Amino acid sequence: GEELIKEEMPMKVVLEGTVNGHQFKCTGEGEGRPYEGVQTMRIKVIEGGPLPFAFDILATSFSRTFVKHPKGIPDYFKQSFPEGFTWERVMRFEDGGVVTVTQDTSLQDGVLIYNAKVRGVNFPSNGPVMQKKTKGWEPNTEMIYPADGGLRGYTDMALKVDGGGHLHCSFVTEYRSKKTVGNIKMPGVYAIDHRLERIEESDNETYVVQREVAVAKYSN
Amino acid sequence: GEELIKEEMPMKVVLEGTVNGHQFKCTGEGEGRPYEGVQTMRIKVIEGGPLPFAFDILATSFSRTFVKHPKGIPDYFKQSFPEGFTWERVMRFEDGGVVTVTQDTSLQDGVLIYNAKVRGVNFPSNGPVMQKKTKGWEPNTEMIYPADGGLRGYTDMALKVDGGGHLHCSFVTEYRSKKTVGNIKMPGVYAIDHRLERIEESDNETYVVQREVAVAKYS
């Protein structure tokens, strides 16, 4: 499992969804250093572009294999290979928008392949998401809890708004390994510090480059 | 102030004190990238070595100028130059050890100068600190609160112990500018993520090299 995840790994993503009835499809390709916790993704909106909502609400749906885990924290995600893992997430914005995401992670001839589906509903028409008045996510900390051979993650995320305030968004995620034959060494409770940054964008946010640093740490 | 702090800065330190009655003195020199939040220091125990306690309890006393503050979080420390700043810290270990630390930070001939005094008492004789069974600090988050011209920092630190457990330690720190006349833009409440790594040691921890990465963030 860990053996199959090299110090350098490429990744590819297909993401399809509907937000407030607007249907789209994105493709992404990138690479990272799974044991250093760093990755970069170049993303294209190939159907439904330009999107009438902030790409920021999609950005967190495009990579758990790339978390730096110190020796003392068993790495559920790297141990899941070769079979990979799935995750399901609910994002609840303080102003009432909701996003549900299902993701499949697989390893296909040494490339990490992500397949994702997104449904967004009830974003206020005049709110910062549908008015495209957002400016990226603040750094955040996700609490990880073992739950019967899977993991649950919870985080309060803060979407920056034009003018300097934030839209708060609760994330709840269930992570499940696809492994059935081998065993996984389960972690106890821990935290993951995440920093997701946009590097560049062009053509009304139909091309986006983003980079994430994510590091697992002891929780007190 | 920020203009005096260059993209690369060297630092020198003198730290002296007593822990459970044991008297010692340390000198250090290093350099880092203050806007990138990275720094490295080479430390010698020049008096009282070898120490009969874990060097880890001194490691966090040896550099606030080297914290990456992103554009929206005003940098109290870099703004305090040329006068610089002071800090006073109480470290309370859950097994009863207490340390008071008093530090002065100044700038001389393009070099950051650190002068620190440490007084540690009531470390258990067969605890991990006095038995030298510690293995570094876990990465941690310090909460920073504005207060009456200064900043107060709060963090629960976790010292790794031989065999895989942790000894917890409360840090409360008061940070005060020596720029007592002149405008500083005050931050609101924020957090600093710290990672302090030992790189090298020799001669029973009387030579230590350590590297720190520190990054301020929204709270």
Domain ranges of chain A: 1-220
Please name the residues in contact with A216: beta carbons below 8 A apart, sequence gap of 6 or more: A67, A68, A69, A70, A73, A75, A144, A190, A191, A192
Phi-psi region of A128 (alpha: psi -120 to 50; beta: other; left: phi over 0): alpha
B158: contact with A, CB 8 A cutoff: yes
The C-alpha of B187 sits at a distance from chain A's nearest C-alpha, in angstroms, of: 14
| Disruptive mutation site among B36, B141, B192 for chain A (greatest number of A CBs within 10 Å) | B141
What's the token pair of residue B155? 């963090």
- CA angle at residue A87 from A85 to A93, to 5 degrees? 160
Three-class SS of chain B = CHHHCCCCEEEEEEEEEEECCEEEEEEEEEEEECCCCEEEEEEEEEECCCCCCCCHHHHCCCCHHHCECCCCCCCHHHHCCCCCEEEEEEEEECCCCEEEEEEEEEEECCEEEEEEEEEEECCCCCCCCCCCCEEEECCEEEEEEEECCEEEEEEEEEEEECCCCEEEEEEEEEEEECCCCCCCCCCCCEEEEEEEEEEEEECCCCEEEEEEEEEEECC
Report the chain A residue with the minimal C-alpha distance to residue B158: A220
Residues B114, B13 contacting (CB under 8 angstroms)? yes
Flag if B156 and A218 touch (Cβ within 8 Å). Answer: no
Experimental method of this PDB entry: X-ray
Resolution in A: 1.8
Report the chain B residue with the minimal C-alpha distance to residue A164: B72
B156: contact with A, CB 8 A cutoff: yes
Flag if A220 and B156 touch (Cβ within 8 Å). Answer: yes
Report the chain A residue with the minimal C-alpha distance to residue B191: A139
Q: What is the DSSP letter of A68?
A: B
